[PDB]
């Protein structure tokens, strides 16, 4: 109705494999970076170069924003740390980047 989810809110993007979830998330992030806001993308199964290149196929130059500095891409894997360590590291990087959107 109002034309977009509320600024400070939580969006869930349920789906199956190969459904476009990561693509819609990257689109949110790219729109934020274009608006000039800061964005962070936490990939727990995909590399930064890999995902950005995968998004080239959808006309998204995520690497451009990453080079500019309005996008911070954190690539990690669950089994490496404990859940507490993952939480702490996520909050750490978020506090240091002061992002506006977080995937």
């Amino acid at each position: 109705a109002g034309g977009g989810f509320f600024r400070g809110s939580s969006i869930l993007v349920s789906g199956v494999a190969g459904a476009g979830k990561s693509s819609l998330a990257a689109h949110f992030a790219a729109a934020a970076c274009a608006r000039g806001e800061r964005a962070m993308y936490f990939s727990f199964e995909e590399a930064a170069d890999q995902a950005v290149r995968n998004m080239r196929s959808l006309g998204l130059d995520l690497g451009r924003w990453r080079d500019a500095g309005l996008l911070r891409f954190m690539a990690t894997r669950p089994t490496f740390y404990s859940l507490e360590m993952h939480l702490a590291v996520i909050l750490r990087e978020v506090m240091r980047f002061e992002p506006s959107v977080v995937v």
């Binding site: 990939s43 170069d49 894997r77």
Partner: protein, 246 residues
């Protein structure tokens, strides 16, 4: 900064970020069969081989021939290094009938230009008789002697009754404590290690599994993830129809 000295063990050197603390004592706690003596053999031999660091191996129980056989069956050419005058084995006993250790160590150190030292079963002296109440004093005495000599130390220990050490005080007199384990889940044995404590550096605070093979004491390196290589070229499947499908 903090001084470091690699063990030559790939993976373990990543956990410790440089290896065991150089010129400081470390305790490799472990029950029978975990591989403490093999870890120390690796320490000294690989220090000589790669890092040009000579060392001396003090054994309080077994014979030098036994040590040589045990480490040689793996592949470590220790007999050659012994006769090369770059490494030395020193045998000491209990129930025979302080400065003796220092003097024998001085002889070996000046003979082989030693900077690394291994003490295998210093337990013997303290455990055979607990009558003297100055056991911790003797422990810290030898520790301070080696620290004065600026020698890296790898003290082995025994952990049968429980805890991390049977002595109860050695774990707190050592700087870097490495616990070795060899547990049996189902009916399968898994070998593990952990950096219980390290003074002044970040270390691997979790159980890293290790293996003892002919290659030696091996640790699967750690963290090999999300560092992928991104190729834009395409690979053939052998099924041209499938290939054309994308």
């Amino acid at each position: 900064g903090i001084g470091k000295s690699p063990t030559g063990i790939q993976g373990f050197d990543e956990l410790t970020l440089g290896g065991l603390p150089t010129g400081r004592p470390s305790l490799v706690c472990g029950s029978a069969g975990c591989g403490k003596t093999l870890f120390a053999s690796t320490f000294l031999i690989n220090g000589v081989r790669d890092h040009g660091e000579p060392g001396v191996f003090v054994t309080f129980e077994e014979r030098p021939e036994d040590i040589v056989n045990n480490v040689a069956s793996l592949g470590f050419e220790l007999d050659k290094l012994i006769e090369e005058e770059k490494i030395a084995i020193e045998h000491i006993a209990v129930d025979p009938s302080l400065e003796g250790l220092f003097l024998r160590l001085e002889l070996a150190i000046d003979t082989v230009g030693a900077k690394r030292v291994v003490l295998d079963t210093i337990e013997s002296l303290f455990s055979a008789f607990s009558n003297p109440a100055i056991l911790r004093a003797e422990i810290r005495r030898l520790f301070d002697w080696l620290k004065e000599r600026g020698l890296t130390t790898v003290i082995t220990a025994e952990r049968g009754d429980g805890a991390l050490t049977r002595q109860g005080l050695e774990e707190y007199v050592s700087d870097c404590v490495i616990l070795l384990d060899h547990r049996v889940e189902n009916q399968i044995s898994t070998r593990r290690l952990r950096i219980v404590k390290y003074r002044g550096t970040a270390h691997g605070t979790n159980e890293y599994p290790f293996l003892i093979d002919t290659d030696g004491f091996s640790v699967l390196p750690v963290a090999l993830g999300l560092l992928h290589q991104v190729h834009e070229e395409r690979i053939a499947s052998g099924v041209p129809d499938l290939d054309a499908m994308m």
